[PDB]
Amino acid sequence: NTPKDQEIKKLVDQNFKPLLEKYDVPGMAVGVIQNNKKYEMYYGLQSVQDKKAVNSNTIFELGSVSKLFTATAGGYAKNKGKISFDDTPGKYWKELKNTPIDQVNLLQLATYTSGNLALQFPDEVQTDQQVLTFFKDWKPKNPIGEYRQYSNPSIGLFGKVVALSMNKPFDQVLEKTIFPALGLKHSYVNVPKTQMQNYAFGYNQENQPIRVNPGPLDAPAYGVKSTLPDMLSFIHANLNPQKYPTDIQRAINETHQGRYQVNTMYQALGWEEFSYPATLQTLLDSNSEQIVMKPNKVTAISKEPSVKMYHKTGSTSGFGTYVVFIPKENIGLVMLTNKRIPNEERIKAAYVVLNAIK
């Protein structure tokens, strides 16, 4: 009657494959997981100049999807009693004790509500000392906890604090503790010399080959690299947290808890959450210029839905990512590209595929 894998391949070919020609994207990996079966589809080239095909070993930059690993590490720490989300940063980074930023709690930092932290650090902040000084010098603007402004520094600081609580630097937290707990084998903060042959180039808007630049608190905000099989395993863990040991199970479940809303989007830890079924437009609205780039007053959750879906977009200058999962249908999807394409196109292609399967 047509086997499931060919059916999924056809749906992906209908919806994702034409994006490659349309946006001149050299390579793409799309996976679906459904009831513990994994489907992997690969297209084009990880390196144009080397004529190297995209494949199950290709390492892609996840950009802001990296925030999901940061949130997971925070969930892991918290459920191990190493932090409380009501703590402030000065408890762990002692140089911030009794400074204005120490009036902001960990949860407000992870969910972008300090009320005065912008998308990026200033370009001049690079070293560990400059990051410290930035935070010591910080002062409040909007009332703490009431306005969401999506921010690398805000969740970067959370990440740093989480690492300090676990007595390891943040790259070691992911590479030694969190990745191995999720069973991931090819995910990295720092890609080692022996895997560089698998690290795709990203491609900028003139299709020039580029990779992410080092930056302040880059790892917790946008600095993870992974493969399609790994990303499918991560979606599998979010769909089936009960199959994992206690510590990481509780961590995953902690990332799913909604904390506030901005209209139809519930801000969980890392993940954005929606009432399921969700319309396409609700998912598109989560990624509008007004939500992503500007401050928005938040609202206490006044309807908690029974059934939810979760997504997150991510980009670096040279790469695009989108992950989405729906626990009720035990289904999820990952897209990786080595050229940014509009977030709208990622969300819609994924919407059509997930809704058509079966």
Tell me how far, at minimum, the Cβ of 216 lies from ligand ZXM, in Å.
11
Cβ count within 10 A of residue 121: 21
Amino acid letter for position 136: K
- Is residue 47 among the annotated active site residues? no
Tell me how far, at minimum, the Cβ of 201 lies from ligand ZXM, in Å.
16
Cβ count within 10 A of residue 38: 16
Between the CA of residue 71 and those of 5, 81, 101, 267, 355, what are the distances in Å? 32, 15, 20, 12, 28
CA 271 to chain centre: 7
Q: Which is nearer to ligand ZXM, 65 or 182 (CB)?
A: 65
- Is residue 266 among the annotated active site residues? no
Residues in the chain after which the chain is broken, C→N over 2.5 Å: none
Tell me how far, at minimum, the Cβ of 337 lies from ligand ZXM, in Å.
13
Residue ranges in the chain assigned as alpha helix (H): 4-15, 18-23, 66-79, 106-110, 128-137, 152-165, 170-172, 179-181, 218-222, 228-239, 246-254, 280-285, 289-293, 343-356
Q: Which is nearer to ligand ZXM, 66 or 165 (CB)?
A: 66
Binding site for ligand ZXM (CB under 6 A): 63-64, 152, 222, 314-317
Place of tokens 């009501």: 86
Tell me how far, at minimum, the Cβ of 345 lies from ligand ZXM, in Å.
14
Cβ count within 10 A of residue 162: 27
Q: Which is nearer to ligand ZXM, 209 or 327 (CB)?
A: 209
Catalytic entry in 39, 43, 47, 64: 64
CB 322 within 8 A of CB 335: yes
Catalytic entry in 43, 150, 244, 266: 150
Place of tokens 């190493």: 82
Q: Which is nearer to ligand ZXM, 258 or 270 (CB)?
A: 270
Could you say which DSSP state residue 92 is in? Answer: T
Q: Which two tokens stand for residue 41?
A: 């589809």
Tell me how far, at minimum, the Cβ of 51 lies from ligand ZXM, in Å.
27
Give the nearest residue (CB) to ligand ZXM: 64
Q: Which is nearer to ligand ZXM, 293 or 307 (CB)?
A: 293
Catalytic residues: 64, 150
